[PDB]
């Protein structure tokens with residue numbers, strides 16, 4: 001009757017919801033070619049779909065943690081899942097690529113609920129031991145989605161309409177809702193205390209005064225930008241630009257995200273014998289080399305996408321190795337409340353992702369693949385520059 005055993009339905013449905021929102025990005029990108037063809041809109045709106053999605057995900061970030069603390073985790077979390085379901089369904093009525101993009105933004109708001117409320121309840125619900133396993137599963141979900149999403153999405157548009165994908169996301173989120181409704185406990189400490197936006201603002205201005213934290217948080221954004229820009233732009237780079245098929249598009253995803261996974265796997269084996277600082281340095285080598293290779297190759301020949309793919313694969317391996325550690329060090333760089341620290345670094349990342357994808361898009365539209373990879377290289381260099389400051 002659920003006390004001990006079915007308690008695990010709560011983290012399981014949170015994980016399911018997380019997955020739904022992630023493929024809500026990752027399946028959609030390859031489907032954006034069908035979408036933009038349906039609306040008769042330019043291919044410049046393809047990466048923008050992801051920009052809007054991620055922009056929405058920085059929207060309520062700062063708010064939801066302290067808000068749910070006051071009015072409770074259950075009603076806020078469940079409202080987020082419902083909002084995801086409703087906005088997933090509403091996009092079928094879009095009628096315009098501008099209105100489509102607006103709904104991508106509104107959909108992305110659902111992202112904020114995962115970390116700021118759902119995971120806050122996890123940390124408040126479970127022992128440090130079990131909590132570790134849960135974050136591990138959430139981390140693995142974040143690994144699987146970008147691998148499976150583009151493959152499933154590319155296959156999907158040869159069979160079913162793009163609208164069906166949003167019906168899928170909504171269905172999966174519906175399952176999480178009913179699971180969370182009957183499982184998730186109320187962990188909120190600060191009911192019914194008042195919330196000061198004035199003092200909340202003061203907290204964020206305080207975390208932003210810490211220079212090491214800001215360096216680490218910005219670096220996490222810059223270093224992952226090439227990966228996310230590839231996710232955003234790969235449908236137009238491959239299919240539109242190189243005139244390859246959907247099958248090849250799918251194939252190129254395998255070494256890149258397989259390498260990401262390989263890097264995390266090597267991380268799990270090294271972590272007991274290696275400090276996070278040295279794993280950052282260890283990952284730094286394939287990160288810089290991979291980005292250098294993709295840039296140099298496509299400046300020599302704009303059309304070599306296999307060298308670009310290899311370079312991104314080597315880079316993604318380094319990311320897999322270096323990233324989890326930088327997240328930890330960045331978290332611990334500030335002594336403030338972890339909810340405030342987490343939301344701050346999530347917002348700084350999203351800021352770099354959204355703006356960076358847009359810059360990336362105009363880079364490729366004007367300069368082709370060479371410029372795509374050159375902009376990715378400067379982002380690597382920005383991460384590197386921040387690391388020599390960050391440590392020590």
Ligand SMILES: CCCCCCCCCCCC[N+](C)(C)[O-]
Nearest residue numbers: 022025026111145146224228231
């Ligand atoms: C490993 C890169 C870390 C980037 C963190 C992005 C937050 C996830 C928001 C949904 C986006 C899904 N995506 C494209 C990252 O796979």
Ligand SMILES: CCCCCCCCCCCC[N+](C)(C)[O-]
Nearest residue numbers: 199200201202203206336337340
């Ligand atoms: C020994 C410390 C206890 C005295 C502080 C009174 C509690 C007020 C809490 C205000 C919240 C501040 N903050 C940083 C969380 O925004």
